[PDB]
Curated annotation (Swiss-Prot), chain A:
One of its GO terms (cellular component) is proton-transporting ATP synthase complex. Mitochondrial membrane ATP synthase (F(1)F(0) ATP synthase or Complex V) produces ATP from ADP in the presence of a proton gradient across the membrane which is generated by electron transport complexes of the respiratory chain. F-type ATPases consist of two structural domains, F(1) - containing the extramembraneous catalytic core, and F(0) - containing the membrane proton channel, linked together by a central stalk and a peripheral stalk. During catalysis, ATP synthesis in the catalytic domain of F(1) is coupled via a rotary mechanism of the central stalk subunits to proton translocation. This is ATP synthase subunit d, mitochondrial. GO terms for biological process: proton motive force-driven ATP synthesis. It comes from Saccharomyces cerevisiae (strain ATCC 204508 / S288c). The lineage of its organism: Eukaryota, Fungi, Dikarya, Ascomycota, Saccharomycotina. F-type ATPases have 2 components, CF(1) - the catalytic core - and CF(0) - the membrane proton channel. In yeast, the dimeric form of ATP synthase consists of 17 polypeptides: alpha, beta, gamma, delta, epsilon, 4 (B), 5 (OSCP), 6 (A), 8, 9 (C), d, E (Tim11), f, g, h, i/j and k. The keyword Acetylation applies. Keywords: Acetylation, ATP synthesis, CF(0), Hydrogen ion transport, Ion transport, Membrane, Mitochondrion, Mitochondrion inner membrane, Transport. The keyword Cell wall biogenesis/degradation does not apply. Disulfide bonds: none annotated.
From Swiss-Prot, chain F:
F-type ATPases have 2 components, CF(1) - the catalytic core - and CF(0) - the membrane proton channel. In yeast, the dimeric form of ATP synthase consists of 17 polypeptides: alpha, beta, gamma, delta, epsilon, 4 (B), 5 (OSCP), 6 (A), 8, 9 (C), d, E (Tim11), f, g, h, i/j and k. It comes from Saccharomyces cerevisiae (strain ATCC 204508 / S288c). GO terms for cellular component: mitochondrial inner membrane; mitochondrion; proton-transporting ATP synthase complex. The chain holds residues 88 to 139 of 244 of the full protein. The keyword Transit peptide applies. One of its GO terms (biological process) is proton motive force-driven ATP synthesis. This is ATP synthase subunit 4, mitochondrial. GO terms for molecular function: proton transmembrane transporter activity. Present with 12900 molecules/cell in log phase SD medium. Keywords: CF(0), Hydrogen ion transport, Ion transport, Membrane, Mitochondrion, Mitochondrion inner membrane, Phosphoprotein, Transit peptide, Transport.
From Swiss-Prot, chain G:
One of its GO terms (molecular function) is proton-transporting ATP synthase activity, rotational mechanism. The modification Phosphothreonine is found at residue 51. F-type ATPases have 2 components, CF(1) - the catalytic core - and CF(0) - the membrane proton channel. CF(1) has five subunits: alpha(3), beta(3), gamma(1), delta(1), epsilon(1). CF(0) has three main subunits: a, b and c. Disulfide bonds: none annotated. InterPro entries: ATP_synth_F1_esu_mt, ATP_synth_F1_esu_sf_mt. It is found in: Mitochondrion; Mitochondrion inner membrane. This is ATP synthase subunit epsilon, mitochondrial. Pfam families: ATP-synt_Eps. Keywords: ATP synthesis, CF(1), Hydrogen ion transport, Ion transport, Membrane, Mitochondrion, Mitochondrion inner membrane, Phosphoprotein, Transport. It comes from Saccharomyces cerevisiae (strain ATCC 204508 / S288c) (Baker's yeast). The gene is ATP15. The lineage of its organism: Eukaryota, Fungi, Dikarya, Ascomycota, Saccharomycotina. The keyword Ion transport applies. Signal peptide: none annotated.
Curated annotation (Swiss-Prot), chain H:
The keyword Ion transport applies. This is ATP synthase subunit delta, mitochondrial. One of its GO terms (molecular function) is proton-transporting ATP synthase activity, rotational mechanism. F-type ATPases have 2 components, CF(1) - the catalytic core - and CF(0) - the membrane proton channel. CF(1) has five subunits: alpha(3), beta(3), gamma(1), delta(1), epsilon(1). CF(0) has three main subunits: a, b and c. The gene is ATP16. Belongs to the ATPase epsilon chain family. Mitochondrial membrane ATP synthase (F(1)F(0) ATP synthase or Complex V) produces ATP from ADP in the presence of a proton gradient across the membrane which is generated by electron transport complexes of the respiratory chain. F-type ATPases consist of two structural domains, F(1) - containing the extramembraneous catalytic core, and F(0) - containing the membrane proton channel, linked together by a central stalk and a peripheral stalk. During catalysis, ATP turnover in the catalytic domain of F(1) is coupled via a rotary mechanism of the central stalk subunits to proton translocation. Transmembrane segments: none annotated. GO terms for cellular component: mitochondrial inner membrane; mitochondrion; proton-transporting ATP synthase complex.
Amino acid sequence: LQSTLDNIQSARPFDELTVDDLTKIKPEIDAKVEEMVKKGKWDVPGYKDRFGNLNVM
Amino acid sequence: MLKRFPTPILKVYWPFFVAGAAVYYGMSKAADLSSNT
Amino acid sequence: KIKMQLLRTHPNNIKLSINGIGKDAPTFQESALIADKLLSVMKAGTYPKISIFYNDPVSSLSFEPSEKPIFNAKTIEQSPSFGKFEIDTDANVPRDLFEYTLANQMLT
Amino acid sequence: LTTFSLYTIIVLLVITSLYTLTNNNNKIIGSRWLISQEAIYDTIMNMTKGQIGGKNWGLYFPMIFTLFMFIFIANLISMIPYSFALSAHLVFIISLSIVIWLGNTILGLYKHGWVFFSLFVPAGTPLPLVPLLVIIETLSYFARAISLGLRLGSNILAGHLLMVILAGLTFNFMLINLFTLVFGFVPLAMILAIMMLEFAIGIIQGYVWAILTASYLKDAVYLH
Amino acid sequence: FYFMNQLTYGFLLMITLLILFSQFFLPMILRLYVSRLFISK
Amino acid sequence: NDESILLLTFLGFTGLVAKYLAPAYKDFADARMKKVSDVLNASRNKHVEAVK
Amino acid sequence: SAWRKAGISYAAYLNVAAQAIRSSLKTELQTASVLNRSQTDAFYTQYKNGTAASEPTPI
Amino acid sequence: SSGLKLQFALPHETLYSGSEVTQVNLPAKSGRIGVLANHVPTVEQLLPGVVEVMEGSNSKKFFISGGFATVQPDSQLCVTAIEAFPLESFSQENIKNLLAEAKKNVSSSDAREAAEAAIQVEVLENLQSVLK
Amino acid sequence: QLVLAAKYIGAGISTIGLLGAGIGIAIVFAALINGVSRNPSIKDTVFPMAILGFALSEATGLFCLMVSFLLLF
Amino acid sequence: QLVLAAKYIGAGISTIGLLGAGIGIAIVFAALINGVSRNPSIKDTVFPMAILGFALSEATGLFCLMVSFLLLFG
Amino acid sequence: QLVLAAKYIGAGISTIGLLGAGIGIAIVFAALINGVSRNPSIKDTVFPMAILGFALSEATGLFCLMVSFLLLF
Amino acid sequence: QLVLAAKYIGAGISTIGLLGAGIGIAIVFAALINGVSRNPSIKDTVFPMAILGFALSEATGLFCLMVSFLLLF
Amino acid sequence: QLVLAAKYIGAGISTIGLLGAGIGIAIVFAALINGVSRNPSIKDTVFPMAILGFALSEATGLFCLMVSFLLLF
Amino acid sequence: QLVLAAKYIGAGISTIGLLGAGIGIAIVFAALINGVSRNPSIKDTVFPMAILGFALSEATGLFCLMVSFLLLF
Amino acid sequence: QLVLAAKYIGAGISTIGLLGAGIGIAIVFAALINGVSRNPSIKDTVFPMAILGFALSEATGLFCLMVSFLLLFG
Amino acid sequence: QLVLAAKYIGAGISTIGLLGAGIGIAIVFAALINGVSRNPSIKDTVFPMAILGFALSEATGLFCLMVSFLLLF
C-alpha cells in the first residue's frame, strides 16, 4: 500500500499518458476492447456513466 | 496510435456489398443497353 | 391553540390570525372560504411548497402533526407522471388543480 | 490524368488525417480540436444503438459510423469560388440508394428469407385488403432510395450552384455604376445567406441520410 | 458518355471505408472510452 | 466574374463564423475538457482514498 | 363565473355556488351543516410580521 | 376494471364512491364532458350543469353547481363536487326564480362584491334548466 | 373539334369540384364522430343533424357534378 | 383529333380533384382515431357509421373519378 | 400532332390530385400520434382504424397516378 | 416539335404536389414533436408511426415528381 | 421558337411547389415552439427530431427547385 | 421575342410561390404569441429559436425571387 | 407586341403571390388576440412581437408585388 | 386588339387576391370573437387591435385590387 501510494501521489499521469498505453497497463484492456467491438456490439454498459456525449455545440 | 482491430464486415457486410456489385453491373449494362451511351 | 403556538415562535411567520375554526363539524363552505382567503392573502399559491403538519389520528390518539406535501400550480402540470392525465392550454388546469388539491387536503 | 481521381483525393487525404493527425498523439484526454470527434461520435452512437435497437444494433452500427461521413465529406465542396461537390454531376447517390434498398430486401431475404412476405402489412388489412396496403408499401420501399438518393444531393447541388446565379446576375451590384452605394448593396448580401443555408443543409442532410438509412434498415431487420 | 469514370472511381472510397474506419476510426474512441471505463472501476 | 463573388464572400462567411462560431466552439470544447478533467480527477482522488 | 377577474379563489366561487344552490332548495334538503356553510363564524384577521392581527372579519 | 367508476365525494357529503356506471355526462369548464365508459386520463374543472350519472340502471340527473371529475386510468371518475343534488329535490320552480333575483340585490354592492356575485347571477338558472 | 374540345375541357374543369364535397361531408362526419366520443350523449341529439350536415356539405359537390352532366350532353 | 386532344387534357386536369378526396379521407380517419383515443369505448360506438362517413367521402371522390372514366370511355 | 401533345399535358397535370392523399396520410398519422401520446393503449385499437384510413386515403392518389400514366400509355 | 414542348409543359405540371407533400410531411413531424413534448414517455409508441407516415407523405410528392420525370426524358 | 420557351414555361409551372413546403416547415417550427413553451424541459429530446423533420421537409422543397432547374438549364 | 416574354411570364409564375414564405413568416409569429401566452417564461428561449425559423421561412420566397430573376433577367 | 400581353398576364399570375402574406398576418393576429385573451399579461409582449411578425411576413408579399410592378411599369 | 383582351384577362386573374383578404380579416375577427368569449374584458385592447390587424390584412386585397384596376385601365 505504501509503495502504490508513492506510485499514486505523483505517479498517475492523467493528462499526458498514451491512450492505447492503457491496454499496456491493463492486459485485458486490449483483449476486451478487441473482444468488445469484435462480436459486433459497439456499446458497453455505461461506458460513459460519468462522462458526456454532447451534441454538435 | 493507429491500429487495425478485427472488424467483421466480411461476414457482416457481405449482403450489401453483393447488392452493390449487382448494381454496378446493372449500371455497366445500362451504360450500353438502357442508356446506349 | 395553533394560532397562539404559531404566534409564539416567529412574529414574521404568522401571515393570518383567524380564530374559532373549531366551532363545529368541518363545514365545506367555511373551509373553502378559509382556503380562498389563503389563496388570496399573500400569494400562497406562489408559495412553491407548503407542508401540512396535520393530525393523523390512527384509531384514538396515535398521531402527531405529520407533514405532507401539496401539489401546487407548477407541480401539477409538470409532474413526471402528469403525462398520464392530460391538461388543456385553454382550461388552465394547473392553477385550479393546485387550488382544489389545497381545498380537499385542508378540509380532510 | 483524370479529374475524378483528384476529386476523390481530398477524401482519401482527409479521412485518415482527421483522426490520425488532428489528435495530438492519440491521447485519451480529448484535445480542443479533438473535442469535435469527442462530441460527434457519441451522438452518432446514440442514434446507432437507438434507431437500430435490439440485437440488430450491433449488426451494422460501424457501417453507420462509416456511411454517414462519406456523403457529408463529398458535399463539403460547396463554398469555394469554383466549388464542386462531384463536378456538378455526382452520380454517387445513385450508387448508395438502390443498392442499399436491395440490401434491405436481402436482409429480408438472406437473414429473414421466405418471411419477407410477412412485413409489408404492419398491422392488418388481411387477404380481403392486403393488396391495397402492399400497393403503398411497395411505393415506400421504392422511394426510400430517392428519399436518401439525390435528396441531400439536390440540397447540396442547389445550395452550391446558387452562387453561379448570384454572380451571373449581380455582377454589377456595385462594380461600375452610380448604384454602388446603399441603393443596391443589399442584393449582394444574399450570397452569405446562401452559404449559411448550404452549410446547415449539408450537415443536416447527412444526418438525415443516416437516420433514414437506419429507419429503412430496422424496418426490414425487425419484422412485426 | 461519362458514366464509367466516377461510378467505381467514387464508390472505391465507399468500399474501402468499411475496412478503414472500423479498424481505424471508431477503434480510437472505443479503446479510449473502454480505458476510461477501466479507470472508472 | 464566374469565380469572383463567391471568392469575396468566403472571407465574409469566415468572419461571420469567427464572430459567433469560433468562441462558441471554444466554449463547447472547454466545457467538455473541464468535465472530463473533473471526471478523471474524482476517480483518481477516490482511488487514492480507496488505497487509503 | 366571474371567478377569473377579481374574486378570491376557485373555492370562493364554488362555495358561493353552493350557497346559491342551497338557496335553490328548501328545508327538506338543506341539512344543519348547510347552516354553518351559510353561517361561517371563521373570523379572518391576517396577522403581520410584527404580529398585527388587524381585524377578525368573518371569513 | 370494466365499466366506469365514479368518485362523487363533495366536501359536504360524499355521494358516489367508485360505483360502476354507463355514463357520467357533465358540463365541464371548457365544454360538455360526456364520459360514458373508461374515458381517458384527463381531469377537468367543472361548470354548473347536469351530471346524469348513468349507472347500470337509469341515469340519475342532478344539476350540480361545480366540481372536478378526475378520470383516473382505472375508469374511475373522481368527481369531487362542491354540492350534492337529487333527481327530485334538485327540481323546483319558485325556489329557482325568486332566489337569484333577490340575490341580484346583493349585486348592488361595490365592485369586488359584484364581481364575486356575478357567479350567483346565473347560478340558480342552471338548476331550473337541468331539472327538466 | 373546337366545340367538343371545349365541351370536354370545361367539363373536366367543372369535374374537379367533387373535391369540395369529398372534404365537406367528411368534415361533418368526423366532427360528429369526435363529438360522440367526447360526448356520448351528443350522438342521439346530433346523428340526424349529422346526416343533415352531410347533405348540407355535399350540395356544393352535387352542383359541381351537375355542370359536367349538362356539359357532356 | 383536336376534340379528342382536349378530352385527354381535361381528363388529366380534372384528376386534380383527388386532393379533396385525400383531405376528406384524412379528416374522417384522423378524427375517428382521435375519438378512439379520447373514448376508447367509442370505437364500437362509432364504427357502424364512421366507416360509412369514410365511404361517403370516398364516393365523392368516386364521383370525381367517374367523369374521367367516361372521358376515356364516352 | 396534338393528341400526343395534349395527352402529355393532361398526364402532367394529373399529378396535382395526389397532394390531398399525400398530406392526408400524414394528417391521419398526426392524429394517431397525438392519440397515442394521450393514450398509448389506444395505439393497438387504432392501428386497425389506421389501416382503414390509410387504405381509403392513399387509393385516390394511387388511382390518380395510374390513370395519369394510362392515358399516356 | 410540339410533342417535346408539351412534354415540357406536362413535366411543369406534375411538380406542384410536392408543395402539398412537404406540407403534410412537415406537419406530421410537427405533430410528433408536439406530442412528444406532451408525453415524453410516448416516444416509443409515436416516433415509428410518424416515421412511417411522413416518409410516405414525402414519397407521394417524390413519385408525383416522377410523373414529370418520364416526360422529361 | 415555341420549343425553347416551352422549357421556360414548364420550369415556371413546376417551380410552384415552394409554397407548400414552406408552409409545412413553418408548421414544424411552430409545433417545436409550442412544445418548447408547454414543455420547457423535454425540449432537447425533440429539438434533434425537430431539425430532422425540418430538413425532411426542406429537402423536398429544394428538390422542387432542382426539378425546376433541370428545365431551367 | 417568342421566348423572352414567355420567360417573363414564367418569372411571374415562379414569383407566385411567395405565398409559402408569407404564410410561414407569420405562422412563426403566431407560435411565438401562443408560447408567450401559454408560457411567458419559455418565450424568452423561444424567441431565439423562433426568429431564426422566421428568417429560415423567408427562404421559400428567396427561391421564388431567384427563379423569377433567372426568368426576368 | 405580345410582350405586353405576356407581361400583363405574368403580373396577374404573380398577383397570387401575396395571398400567403394575407392569411399569414391573419393567423398572426389570431394567435396574438387569442393569447391576449388567454393572458393579458402577455399583451405587451405580443405587440412587440406582433409588429415584427406582420411586417416581416408582408415583406415577401411586397417582393412578389414588386416582381409584378417590374412587369407592370419597368 | 390583343393588348386589351390581355388586360381584361389579367385583371380578372389579379382579382383572385381578394380571397386572401376575405379569409384574413375573417381570421382576425374570428380571433376577436373567440378571445372575447374566453376573456370578455380584453375586448377593449383587442377590438382596436383587431381593427389594426384588419388594416394590416385587408390592405393585401386592396393592393391586389388596385393593381388589377390599374391593369384593366
